[PDB]
Amino acid sequence: SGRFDQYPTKKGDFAIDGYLLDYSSPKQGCWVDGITVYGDIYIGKQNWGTYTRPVFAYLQYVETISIPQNVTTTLSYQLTKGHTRSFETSVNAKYSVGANIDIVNVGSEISTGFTRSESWSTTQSFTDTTEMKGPGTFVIYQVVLVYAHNATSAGRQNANAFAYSKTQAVGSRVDLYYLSAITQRKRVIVPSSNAVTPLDWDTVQRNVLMENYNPGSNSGHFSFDWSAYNDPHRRY
Ligand SMILES: [Hg+2]
Ligand SMILES: [Hg+2]
Ligand SMILES: [Zn+2]
Ligand SMILES: [Zn+2]
């Protein structure tokens, strides 16, 4: 399907909830209107001054379950916190970010629902439960928050750090553009009849960064707000 122009744009958790609570048609994801912040991100061998903004949110597959007629059960399933399993498996270089980057979420009216030390850390699995009743086949998904980054000057040394990236020259400096993803403490359960094939990390990066963002003009479906550098409230 691709064609990410089909997805709407939402600002903050109330708007994302509005999108997900509209059961009139199956939902896969949305572009996110969020603020840009500036601060350190460790990539490869050092910290780089990085611009970060939220850009997309999507539902990533957890599991499918079929329950017979007259059966009520407490279903246990694994959700994750911190960076997504797909993001973690896709990165080639040493990668880490301090907890204070979360000002990007606060300023964008998004909350991860996880602790300060958990939200931007390594992938950590946890058990979640829902009492469910049959008959039916149901698919469980977890909300993924996607961010675009410009790690300034990182492009000469880290051009192969990520599965998908773009470098851009600024005078004699080389910037590194890439996406990252973390989870939110939010999961959706839908009958197999109200379900479509969910988006995955490879598809999201190809469409959002490679096809829909142009570092050359800082345009496409989103733009970074460079004024973050000059705003103390958006520096972490
Ligand atoms: Hg969404
Ligand atoms: Hg997001
Ligand atoms: Zn905005
Ligand atoms: Zn401000």
Swiss-Prot record:
InterPro entries: BB_PF
Example of a GO biological process term: hemolysis in another organism
CDD domains reported for this sequence: PFM_monalysin-like
KO phenotype (gene knockout): Reduced cell death is observed upon infection with a mutant deficient in Monalysin production. This mutant is affected in its abilities to induce cell damage in the Drosophila gut. It induces lower level of stress and repair pathway activity than wild-type.
A GO CC annotation given for this chain: host cell plasma membrane
Domain of life: Bacteria
Quaternary structure note: Pro-Monalysin forms a stable donut-like 18-mer complex composed of two disk-shaped nonamers held together by N-terminal swapping of the pro-peptides. After proteolytic cleavage, the inactive 18-mer complex probably dissociates into two disk-shaped active nonamers in which the transmembrane segments are unmasked and ready to engage the conformational change leading to the pore formation into the target membrane. Multimerizes into circular-like structures and barrel-like aggregates.
Domain comment as written in the entry: Monalysin structure belongs to the Aerolysin-like PFTs fold family but is devoid of obvious receptor-binding domain.
Name of the protein: Monalysin
Gene for this chain: mnl
